[PDB]
Amino acid sequence: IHFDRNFYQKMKVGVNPRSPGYFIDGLRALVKLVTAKYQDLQENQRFVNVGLEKLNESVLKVNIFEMLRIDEGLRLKIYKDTEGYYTIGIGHLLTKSPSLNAAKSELDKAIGRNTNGVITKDEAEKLFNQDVDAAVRGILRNAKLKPVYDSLDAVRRAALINMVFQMGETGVAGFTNSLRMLQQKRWDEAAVNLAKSRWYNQTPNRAKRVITTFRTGTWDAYISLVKSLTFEKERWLNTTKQFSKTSQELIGNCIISSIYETYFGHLNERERADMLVILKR
Amino acid sequence: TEYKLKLKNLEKRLLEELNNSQGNMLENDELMVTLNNLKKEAMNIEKKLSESEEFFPQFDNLVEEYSIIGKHSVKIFSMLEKFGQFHWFYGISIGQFLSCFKRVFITRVDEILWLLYQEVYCQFSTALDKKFKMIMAMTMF
């Protein structure tokens, strides 16, 4: 009402030479916009709240292993790799033979069980830790990689162990530029060189994560490798607190909008400005 | 709305494939890297979201600092309009005026202002006969 009376005062000249349908056209548009924005608001609040629900359910019960799980992947049943060979768990190759049961023979000889190629959780990590130790023992054997692996901190080692699991130690050794700079402990120039390679162009996702791990010597790109980093999404509930703003001023915002649609159409730039100022005060 | 639809998009991928089957022993981790990627896109969001609160007052201030250029140009224009009302050849549109003002570019605000007068004179002096050049000089001055 104050805006109507103010509008007519500060704009229209003359003693009652006009009607008040701005008021009504203005009450109705407000009913429209408060409803629309309010519904859309509640829809959002429901969505983050049932989302938050599935996250509270997502916490149930309760490291290089999570690393190698992430880019390579964990399988509890036998499958085939990119080259189609026989593999189980994390990158553990039973046989390169096209034979279907040649893998089952090797696995059963490895884990010491009669399984058809279906394995339990712990055995996945056992075969992994085993594959790793073996890869580490081999690096120390290799005279091109050994000084580097000795140089690096545990985290960056885990990165080198990762490159070995993909490319094979013989493959990691051809990196002599990148490896030299890695032992010289200049991590940026090392990362810039690692970026240039057939290894990058082929799998520049994994290669990108390994590289920023070499850089930062940190697990973040990839000790946060625990699914507990998912627990961190829990603190992104802050949206719930942001609403309390958006909605508190929702009504006010819709008033301006209703009035702006209705009264302002025929007004100068300067007119809308000052009228809006009156409206806000 | 693009970034919040990108977040909602991965927030959708999270909900979708978190319920999928049950155990999720392996793959949901292969999704978690996509939600780890979600965390980076969520930092992109907070980066834009934080530089919004910085934008508004810097903007709101810049309209005040440039006020003067506007208020001079409304009177300089008004003058040219009045030349046009005396004789048919002397018309001008806000188009030509703005087009002239663009040339000003291609104590800062002072300079941009001083240039305004000098460029408006320099151009439109030519569309007027000697009498009005002299009226125009004295008025604008």
From Swiss-Prot, chain A:
Which reaction is this enzyme known to catalyze?
A: Hydrolysis of (1->4)-beta-linkages between N-acetylmuramic acid and N-acetyl-D-glucosamine residues in a peptidoglycan and between N-acetyl-D-glucosamine residues in chitodextrins
Q: List the disulfide bonds.
A: none
| Mutagenesis or variant effect for residue 81 to E/Q | Loss of 99% of enzymatic activity
Family annotation (Gene3D superfamilies): 1.10.530.40
Q: Record's Gene Ontology CC terms?
A: host cell cytoplasm
Entry's Gene Ontology BP terms: cell wall macromolecule catabolic process; defense response to bacterium; peptidoglycan catabolic process; viral release from host cell by cytolysis
**Pfam families, sorted:** Phage_lysozyme
pH-related activity note: Optimum pH is 7.3.
**What does altering residue 193 to I do?**
5-fold decrease in enzymatic activity
List, alphabetically, the InterPro entries matched.
Endolysin_T4_type, Glyco_hydro_24, Lysozyme-like_dom_sf, Lysozyme_dom_sf, Phage_lysozyme-like, T4-type_lysozyme
What is the name listed in the Swiss-Prot or TrEMBL entry for this protein? Endolysin
Query: Native species of this protein?
Result: Enterobacteria phage T4
What's the gene?
E
Swiss-Prot record, chain B:
Which residues does UniProt call coiled coil? Answer: 1-56
* Record remark on domains: Dynein heavy chains probably consist of an N-terminal stem (which binds cargo and interacts with other dynein components), and the head or motor domain. The motor contains six tandemly-linked AAA domains in the head, which form a ring. A stalk-like structure (formed by two of the coiled coil domains) protrudes between AAA 4 and AAA 5 and terminates in a microtubule-binding site. A seventh domain may also contribute to this ring; it is not clear whether the N-terminus or the C-terminus forms this extra domain.
Self-association or partners: how does it assemble?
The dynein complex consists of at least two heavy chains and a number of intermediate and light chains. Interacts with DYN3.
> Could you share any additional remarks the record makes about this protein?
Present with 195 molecules/cell in log phase SD medium.
Could you say which protein family the record assigns here? Belongs to the dynein heavy chain family.
* Protein purpose: Cytoplasmic dynein acts as a motor for the intracellular retrograde motility of vesicles and organelles along microtubules. Dynein has ATPase activity; the force-producing power stroke is thought to occur on release of ADP. Required to maintain uniform nuclear distribution in hyphae. May play an important role in the proper orientation of the mitotic spindle into the budding daughter cell yeast. Probably required for normal progression of the cell cycle.
| Protein name per UniProt | Dynein heavy chain, cytoplasmic
- Organism of origin is Saccharomyces cerevisiae (strain ATCC 204508 / S288c) (Baker's yeast)
Quick one: which gene encodes this? DYN1
